[PDB]
């Protein structure tokens, strides 16, 4: 049938791509970086502890100033912290308590959040009457919002469980661009350092690179064995790391179009919830179901330290834009800073 | 600039005392997650409590808020972890639609052995018992064609049939009851329990059952916390 011919042609295309990748794999990243010196033992310690949340935390995002940060708990709250002095700047109650993601606009003017209500809510932090309240609210998704990140104060991209991502114009409230093609639920998105492109990790064990301004999928990577739960970019912008339920971290390159390195240990059998690079990209931090956070050497595949400080599942983490510290949110209702 | 430190400190004070009032309200609120297939009698249970994502009801000065997700897809895998801390899951099943009982058993098995729901107790509602009695008394679709174990099944000695209930109806609904308990007792190991209940669409005593079973859940949790039970 026509459908049969189509499947045959697609299998052919896949074989062709696989072969191009085989052609580019003359060496491995470990052989190339075997002569580098190891980063040494990395023993980070808890420098701050941020308390107050009544339920399991699901999302956090540092600000550009590396001082303020937002945290989302499923008690229906979104608390903003002054990480230096542990003071709370705002405590925003949510109309729906089932929040799953939260972002902090790079201008510090707005926060966003969403969850099982299928709605992205924007809150204006620079209110004129005194208190932060709802400003906009983005509707249209048929699935749960898993991740969202601002580009500027009027454009925002979202990831949803309807197997789609969407680019929004916050003012008009219209989905200015739609990203379809994932088979399973999209769990995480990561914006390029230049706002120009972004990748998405879905439950089909695949990541996709999307052109922000044109709305087309440029590259599709299939390296993970199970659902991809987290994704971050290398500071350079031409590489990214993913974490999945198969207890592995993987580094993909954009220009080479294949995996470069796999981060695993045979004593780690539990999934991965969050991933993030250091300022130089030399350190890769990953949060696991085993209550710990592992710091991997992104060049040598060696683990250089552990962060054993949470009493429940580590749900999220994130490094400041100045690289001074990393924060970790877990299901114990606590945030911890590690410098 | 020290004044700005005192303004931040009193803003933090007003925040923490609002969070203290929110803590007191949240600590006494019983979150209840409602799960189950469609065309099962899900909307009728909420109608009886008096379709909507939310429900708010009080039993004996104790508030509950029960939620069913409606605009979700059917892959309940990743969003299930949004309910690892709920007080109880109310799983609704059809005792009458014999073709879909294996689906209910598979969903119950995946919920009971979930890595993140190891401690969440489930209140099992076996809905549509009147239709179940209709089908069993009619004798056109027999349970043995779908569950051959039913041929060798013996009515339990603890069974409490209603006045006039046909022993065939008693054995059928207690067979489905034990079909779910055979799963619940295989790997619960005292961390959580399953509480079966026979319900019909016009049964007004459903909030009382959930009240009693939530009280039993908390009693058992406290008893195991002190290592007694």
């Amino acid at each position, epitope marked *: 049938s026509e459908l049969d011919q189509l*499947r045959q042609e697609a299998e052919q295309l*896949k074989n062709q791509i696989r072969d191009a990748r085989k052609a580019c794999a003359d060496a491995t990243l470990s052989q190339i970086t075997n002569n580098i010196d190891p980063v040494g033992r990395i023993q980070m310690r808890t420098r701050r502890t941020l308390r107050g949340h009544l339920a399991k935390i699901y999302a956090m995002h540092w600000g550009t100033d590396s001082r303020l940060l937002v945290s989302a708990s499923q008690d229906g709250k979104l608390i903003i912290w002054d990480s230096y002095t542990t003071n709370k700047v705002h405590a925003i109650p949510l109309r729906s308590s089932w929040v799953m993601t939260c972002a902090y606009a790079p201008s510090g003017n707005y926060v966003a959040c969403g969850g099982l209500d299928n709605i992205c809510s924007i809150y204006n932090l620079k209110t004129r009457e005194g208190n932060v309240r709802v400003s906009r609210e983005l509707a249209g998704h048929t699935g749960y919002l898993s991740c969202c990140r601002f580009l500027d104060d009027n454009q925002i991209v979202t990831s949803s469980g309807d*197997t789609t991502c969407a680019l929004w114009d916050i003012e008009t409230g219209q989905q200015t661009t739609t990203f379809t093609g994932h*088979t*399973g639920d999209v769990m995480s998105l990561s914006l390029a350092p230049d706002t120009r492109l972004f990748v998405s990790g*879905a*439950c*089909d*064990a695949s990541a996709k690179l999307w052109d922000v301004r044109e709305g087309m999928c440029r590259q599709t990577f*299939t390296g993970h*064995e*199970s*659902d991809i739960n987290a994704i971050c970019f290398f500071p350079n912008g031409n590489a990214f790391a993913t974490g999945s*339920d*198969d*207890a592995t971290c993987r580094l993909f390159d954009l220009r080479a179009d294949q995996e470069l390195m796999t981060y695993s240990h045979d004593n780690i*059998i539990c*999934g991965i919830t969050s991933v993030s690079f250091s300022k130089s990209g030399r350190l890769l931090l990953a949060g696991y179901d085993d209550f710990n956070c592992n710091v991997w050497d992104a060049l040598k595949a060696d683990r250089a330290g552990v962060l054993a400080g949470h009493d429940n599942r580590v749900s999220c983490l994130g490094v400041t834009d100045d690289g001074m510290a990393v924060a970790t949110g877990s299901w114990d209702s606590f945030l911890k800073i590690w410098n | 600039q020290r004044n700005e430190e005192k303004a931040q400190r009193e803003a933090n004070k007003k925040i923490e005392k609002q969070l203290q009032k929110d803590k007191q309200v949240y600590r006494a609120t019983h979150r209840l997650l409602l799960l189950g297939a469609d065309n099962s009698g899900k909307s009728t249970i909420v109608k009886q409590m008096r379709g909507i994502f939310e429900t708010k009801f009080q039993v004996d000065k104790v508030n509950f808020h029960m939620f069913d997700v409606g605009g979700q897809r*059917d*892959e*309940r*895998r990743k969003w299930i972890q949004c309910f690892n801390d709920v007080t109880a899951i109310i799983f609704v099943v059809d005792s009458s639609d014999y073709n879909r009982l*294996q*689906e209910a058993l*598979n*969903l119950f*098995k*995946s*919920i*009971w*052995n*979930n*890595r993140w729901l190891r401690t969440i107790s489930v209140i099992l509602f076996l809905n549509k018992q009147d239709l179940l009695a209709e089908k069993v008394l009619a004798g056109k679709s027999k349970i043995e*064609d*779908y*569950f*051959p*174990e039913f041929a060798r099944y013996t009515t339990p000695e603890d069974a409490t049939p209603e006045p006039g209930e046909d022993p065939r109806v008693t054995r059928a609904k207690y067979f489905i009851r034990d079909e779910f308990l055979r799963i619940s007792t295989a*790997s619960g190991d005292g961390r959580h329990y399953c509480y079966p209940h026979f319900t019909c669409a016009v049964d007004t005593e459903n909030a009382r059952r959930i009240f009693n079973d939530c009280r039993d859940i908390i009693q058992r949790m406290h008893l195991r916390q002190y290592e007694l039970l």
Partner: nanobody
Amino acid sequence: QVQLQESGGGLVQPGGSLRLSCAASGFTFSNYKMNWVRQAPGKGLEWVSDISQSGASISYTGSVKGRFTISRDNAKNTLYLQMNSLKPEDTAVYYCARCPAPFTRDCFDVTSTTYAYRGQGTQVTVSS
């Protein structure tokens, strides 16, 4: 690339025997619980049979109980379903479905429309 090809099945008279063989690539076969799920024409998907990580735990639907067998070859990395005593109601498209996560006893792989870790299908007909 999580890749599945099931094979076998065809025009078989009632009472016949069939062998369905699912070849799996892109993942570690031993770590994953596996299922056989069938889709009858004009009806939704129903779960047929389960397996364990090492084959220790086995379960079937009541319809196929005592007539269908499921097995694993970890070294060769295949999942086998021996179908015996076929009935006209047994005509359906057969899928070998992997449970989403390793080292788990639970999975949600009877997805109505789109389950990622699912095969293309081998339609099986039983008729006189």
